[PDB]
Amino acid sequence: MIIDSQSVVQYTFKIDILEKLYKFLPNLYHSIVNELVEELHLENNDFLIGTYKDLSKAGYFYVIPAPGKNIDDVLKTIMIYVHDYEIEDYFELEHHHH
Amino acid sequence: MIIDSQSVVQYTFKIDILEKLYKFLPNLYHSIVNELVEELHLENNDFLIGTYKDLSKAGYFYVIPAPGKNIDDVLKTIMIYVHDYEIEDYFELEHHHH
């Protein structure tokens, strides 16, 4: 059974480029964020990550590192996966939307 | 970047039959607990689980459910995997050790 409990930290990590993608191509944003979260979970066993329900927090992720896992290492891993989508590419065509 | 943080709960779940296995067949215990943790992580994406470094806590696991995940559901899942090892079997032969 459960015999004890203690507080652990849950971080809110803002990923600027994803928040901006959401503002411009929300549907693409949804696709990328869900593959991102799935792949991070499939390839990493030492942290939890997820989106928030509030759309005002689109682009923000909750992050919970396992005991003994360095939060800053988790962020580096998340960003490596994020950079791989080369989201910068999309903003180059945003002007067609004016 | 990190823009906020909050406290989340980390539970200590004692698994009696594993604690008892550790007391009698520590090496088997080590093998089972490490496959258990690996399989729970591979097949479940909504909670973190792990052993503690203190051997006095052998048989106890830290458990951190993702936001919105019901801790009691996590325990049921853990026990399903634990029961599958049929650890009761081992204690039947413990008397040969007297």
Write up this protein:
The structure is a homodimer of 98-residue chains. Chain A has 98 residues and is an alpha+beta fold. Chain A has one domain (1-98): Alpha-Beta Plaits. Helices cover 46% and strands 24% of the residues of chain A. Chain A is built from four helices and three strands, in the order βααββαα. In chain A, strands 1-3-2 form a three-stranded antiparallel β-sheet. In chain A, helix 1 (16-24) runs antiparallel to helix 2. The longest helix of chain A is centred in the middle third of the chain and has 18 residues, at 26-43. Chain A is elongated and about 60 Å long. The interface between A and B is medium-sized, with 28 and 28 residues. Strand 1 of chain A pairs antiparallel with strand 1 of chain B, so a sheet runs across the interface.
Q: Helix and strand layout, with pairings?
A:
The structure is a homodimer of 98-residue chains.
Chain A: E1 2-14, H1 16-24, H2 26-43, E2 47-51, E3 60-65, H3 71-84, H4 88-91
Antiparallel strand pairs in A: 1-3, 2-3
Keywords (chains A, B): Endonuclease, Host-virus interaction, Hydrolase, Inhibition of host innate immune response by virus, Nuclease, Restriction-modification system evasion by virus, Viral immunoevasion
Function (chains A, B): Pays a role in the inhibition of the host restriction-modification system. Strongly inhibits the host mcrA endonuclease that cleaves 5-methyl and 5-hydroxymethylcytosines at the specific DNA sequence C(me)CGG.
InterPro entries (chains A, B): Anti-Restrict_Endo_sf (IPR053757), Arn (IPR054385)
